[PDB]
Amino acid sequence: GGFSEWKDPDAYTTKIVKAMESKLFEKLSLPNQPEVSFLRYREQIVSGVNYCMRVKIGSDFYDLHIYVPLGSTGDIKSHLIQLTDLHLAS
Amino acid sequence: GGFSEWKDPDAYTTKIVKAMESKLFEKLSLPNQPEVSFLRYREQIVSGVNYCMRVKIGSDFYDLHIYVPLGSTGDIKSHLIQLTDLHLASE
């Protein structure tokens, strides 16, 4: 949940900005395709596994939607595991 | 929809379900800590990078929120790059 410090453009991120220009001009309704000047960027790695856990409690069956960020397990940094959703398997 | 086939429980996922039992009981308002039986699971790896791109268009400054999934770049499988949000830097 933490973005990096601001960084100067590089070739890798410039290619990503240029790749998005089509979608940019549409979300802005700018049709003449005005120049897009790339000034700086921040980044945030996001890695993890979403789990759908089927569990029985009482006579009822549930879907437990759980997100485990990279670096966490059931034993390591387990406070960062998220219970994202819970509902009857129905 | 990006999720694996159903899998039998394993040591790794069983520990994760056991860790979540407190939050389970509380969300359900079940006070006596009944047995939670773990039957099967499926998983979906999600990996990539969120970019905040500061750009100028005409005389205005924007934050461009772009998500690049692992395995994608500006040149490789670039059709999977997502423009998640766009707004004036001043907002």
Q: How far, in Å, CA of A81 to CA of B47, rounded?
A: 16
Under an 8 A CB cutoff, do A54 and B74 touch? no
Say what the resolution is, in angstroms: 2.0
Distance between CA atoms of A88 and B14, rounded to whole angstroms? 19
- Classify B55 as helix, strand or coil: strand
Work out the minimum CA distance from A77 to partner chain B, whole angstroms: 11
CA distance A63 to A43: 33
Quickly count helices (H) and strands (E) in chain A.
2, 3
Cβ–Cβ of B17/A50 closer than 8 Å? no
Q: Which residues of A touch B68 (CB under 8 A)?
A: 16
Q: Within 10 A of A79 (CB to CB), how many other CB atoms are there? A: 6
CA distance B88 to chain A (A): 11
Strand order in the sheet with A82-88: A82-88, A60-69, A36-57, B36-57, B60-69, B82-88
CB atoms closer than 10 angstroms to residue A17: 22
Q: Are strands B36-57 and A82-88 parallel, antiparallel or unpaired?
A: unpaired
Residue written as tokens 């933490």? Answer: A2
Place of tokens 């980044």: A43
Distance CA A40, CA A17 (A): 11
Of A20, A34, A56, the CB nearest to B39: A56
Query: Going by C-beta distance under 8 Å and a sequence separation of 6 or more, which residues neighbour residue B75?
Result: A15
Of A16, A57, A68, the CB nearest to B66: A16
Please report residues of B whose CB lies closer than 8 A to that of A73: 12, 15-16
Q: Helix (H, G, I), strand (E, B), or coil: what is residue A3?
A: coil
User: Phi then psi for A59, rounded to 5 degrees?
Assistant: -100, 10
Place of tokens 């990006």: B2
**b/e sequence B53-71, b meaning 16+ C-beta within 10 Å:** bbbebeeeebbbebbbeee
Residue pair B65/B73 in contact (Cβ under 8 Å)? The answer is no
Between CA A87 and CA B4 the distance in angstroms is: 20
Question: Is the Cβ pair A64, B15 closer than 8 Å?
Answer: no
Does A24 sit within 8 Å of B57, measured CB to CB? yes
**Count of CB pairs separated by less than 8 Å, A with B:** 163
